[PDB]
Enzyme design. Structure first.
Site, PDB file in Angstrom:
ATOM      1  N   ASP A   1      -4.011  -4.893   1.189  1.00 28.49           N
ATOM      2  CA  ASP A   1      -4.453  -4.248   2.419  1.00 28.49           C
ATOM      3  C   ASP A   1      -5.884  -4.700   2.715  1.00 28.49           C
ATOM      4  OD1 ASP A   1      -5.373  -2.638   4.422  1.00 28.49           O
ATOM      5  OD2 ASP A   1      -4.542  -0.774   3.642  1.00 28.49           O
TER       6      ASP A   1
ATOM      7  N   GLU B   1      -3.842   1.520  -2.935  1.00 29.55           N
ATOM      8  CA  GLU B   1      -4.106   2.938  -2.671  1.00 29.55           C
ATOM      9  C   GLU B   1      -3.214   3.844  -3.532  1.00 29.55           C
ATOM     10  OE1 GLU B   1      -4.331   3.788   1.615  1.00 29.55           O
ATOM     11  OE2 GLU B   1      -5.359   5.670   1.124  1.00 29.55           O
TER      12      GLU B   1
ATOM     13  N   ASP C   1      -0.044   4.383  -0.585  1.00 32.03           N
ATOM     14  CA  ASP C   1      -0.786   5.549  -0.107  1.00 32.03           C
ATOM     15  C   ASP C   1      -0.397   6.809  -0.873  1.00 32.03           C
ATOM     16  OD1 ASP C   1      -2.688   6.895   1.317  1.00 32.03           O
ATOM     17  OD2 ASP C   1      -1.950   6.277   3.281  1.00 32.03           O
TER      18      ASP C   1
ATOM     19  N   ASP D   1       2.666   5.240   4.554  1.00 27.99           N
ATOM     20  CA  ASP D   1       2.448   4.854   5.938  1.00 27.99           C
ATOM     21  C   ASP D   1       2.313   3.338   6.086  1.00 27.99           C
ATOM     22  OD1 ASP D   1       0.049   5.011   4.534  1.00 27.99           O
ATOM     23  OD2 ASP D   1      -1.075   6.000   6.105  1.00 27.99           O
ATOM     24  N   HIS D   2       2.437   2.584   4.992  1.00 37.48           N
ATOM     25  CA  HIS D   2       2.606   1.139   5.079  1.00 37.48           C
ATOM     26  C   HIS D   2       3.989   0.762   4.596  1.00 37.48           C
ATOM     27  CE1 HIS D   2      -1.893   0.057   5.027  1.00 37.48           C
ATOM     28  NE2 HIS D   2      -1.794   1.372   5.062  1.00 37.48           N
TER      29      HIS D   2
ATOM     30  N   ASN E   1      -7.275  -4.264   5.728  1.00 34.10           N
ATOM     31  CA  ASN E   1      -7.830  -3.257   6.642  1.00 34.10           C
ATOM     32  C   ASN E   1      -8.481  -3.871   7.882  1.00 34.10           C
ATOM     33  OD1 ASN E   1      -7.268  -0.479   5.870  1.00 34.10           O
ATOM     34  ND2 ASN E   1      -8.412  -0.910   3.993  1.00 34.10           N
TER      35      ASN E   1
ATOM     36  N   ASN F   1       0.856  -1.180   0.000  1.00 29.76           N
ATOM     37  CA  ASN F   1       0.000   0.000   0.000  1.00 29.76           C
ATOM     38  C   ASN F   1       0.900   1.239   0.000  1.00 29.76           C
ATOM     39  OD1 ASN F   1      -1.415   2.354   0.925  1.00 29.76           O
ATOM     40  ND2 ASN F   1      -3.051   1.068   1.785  1.00 29.76           N
TER      41      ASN F   1
ATOM     42  N   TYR G   1      -7.646  -3.868  -1.992  1.00 28.43           N
ATOM     43  CA  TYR G   1      -7.564  -2.697  -1.122  1.00 28.43           C
ATOM     44  C   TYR G   1      -8.955  -2.613  -0.512  1.00 28.43           C
ATOM     45  CZ  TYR G   1      -7.385   2.078   0.570  1.00 28.43           C
ATOM     46  OH  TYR G   1      -7.421   3.166   1.408  1.00 28.43           O
TER      47      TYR G   1
ATOM     48  N   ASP H   1      -1.712  -5.818   6.173  1.00 27.97           N
ATOM     49  CA  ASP H   1      -1.353  -6.338   4.859  1.00 27.97           C
ATOM     50  C   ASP H   1      -1.005  -7.821   4.945  1.00 27.97           C
ATOM     51  OD1 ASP H   1      -1.263  -3.629   3.292  1.00 27.97           O
ATOM     52  OD2 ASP H   1      -0.220  -3.267   5.196  1.00 27.97           O
TER      53      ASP H   1
END
Length: 276
Positions: A168, A54, A28, A266-267, A170, A26, A129, A241
């Site tokens: 991801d 993402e 982001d 941020d991953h 989540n 991910n 995702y 993840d």
DNA sequence: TCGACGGATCC
DNA sequence: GCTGATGCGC
DNA sequence: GGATCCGTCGAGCGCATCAGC
């Protein structure tokens, strides 16, 4: 406490050398990730397949450095139709797949570019995702409808060829999988409804969590840290993840890595080593 | 979402 | 075309 | 009165649109 991923196991539990390396990430914001040198890390990691989540970038805005990847020249992108700069997944492979398709068959659920299905000679790769339940659980009830649809989609597929799902998802399946599990039971990613959905996914398809099948009691091993409050330095983070495997693929499983130190999002990346 | 707070409670 | 404010979703 | 389980407000990033120039 801090976490140093154990070294790469590149031989199968019966002694077969790994022949396939899949990395999922991910990013982001693909264009930010690229500027923050993410493609450098991928060339060092040199996977056979890179799944990106993402992206927040439509196909025609992809930077040029993405084409000048020789070992990953087959690229397939799926962005949402309405929301610019939102969601979006990518799949890049060294060898062209047999089939590529987008979405999970529903229509309430294939409007956001969250899923790419890539079929290869011996396995089917899906990358997701998964929709976030949002601040204040505004979208949790949608998330649960998603889960059930995704779950049925994967089952109605893992019964021709074995399934690799990555990306991801989540959700932190268990308290092991996050640093503050009880300050977070009403926050997106650790709600009971999300958690039990993950288990539903593991039972129904069925699948196996590669990392937790190789490290069933290793703690502090996260893939996601919020940008806020230096959460990453304090290793206060979540494991969002996954690589999830058909049962018939555990014999082939060599290692499932968490690449804690790669930056750009941020991953952090995750990397899977199969023997095929 | 996390890490400050207050407020309330259990020995 | 570029910057900065404002909005939104994590 | 130390160790709780709470509810709250504070907390970085990237991207889109818009206005000004």
């Amino acid at each position: 406490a801090l976490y140093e991923d154990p070294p790469d196991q590149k031989t199968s539990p019966s002694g077969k050398p790994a022949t396939l390396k899949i990395c999922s990430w991910n990013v982001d914001g693909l264009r930010a990730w690229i500027k923050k040198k993410g493609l450098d890390w991928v060339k060092e990691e040199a996977p056979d397949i890179l799944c990106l989540q993402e992206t927040k970038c439509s196909e025609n805005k992809l930077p040029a450095e993405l084409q000048e990847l020789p070992g990953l020249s087959h690229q397939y992108w799926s962005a949402p139709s309405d929301k610019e700069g939102y969601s979006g997944v990518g799949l890049l492979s060294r060898q062209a797949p047999l089939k590529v398709s987008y979405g999970i068959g529903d229509e309430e659920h294939d409007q956001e570019g969250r899923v790419i299905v890539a079929e290869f000679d011996s396995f089917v790769l899906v990358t997701a995702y998964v929709p976030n339940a949002g601040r204040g659980l505004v979208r949790l009830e949608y998330r649960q409808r998603w889960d059930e649809a995704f779950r049925k989609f994967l089952k109605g597929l893992a019964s021709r060829k074995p399934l690799v799902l990555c990306g991801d998802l989540n959700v932190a399946h268990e308290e092991i999988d996050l640093r503050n599990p009880k300050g977070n039971k009403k926050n997106a990613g650790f709600t009971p409804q999300e958690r039990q959905g993950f288990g539903e996914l593991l039972q129904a398809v069925p699948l196996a969590d590669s990392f937790r099948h190789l490290y069933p009691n290793t703690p502090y091993a996260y893939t996601f840290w919020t940008y806020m409050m230096n959460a990453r330095s304090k290793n206060v983070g979540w494991r969002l993840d996954y690589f999830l495997l058909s049962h018939s693929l555990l014999p082939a499983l060599c290692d499932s890595k968490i690449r804690s130190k790669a930056l750009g999002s941020d991953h952090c990346p995750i990397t899977l080593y199969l023997a095929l």
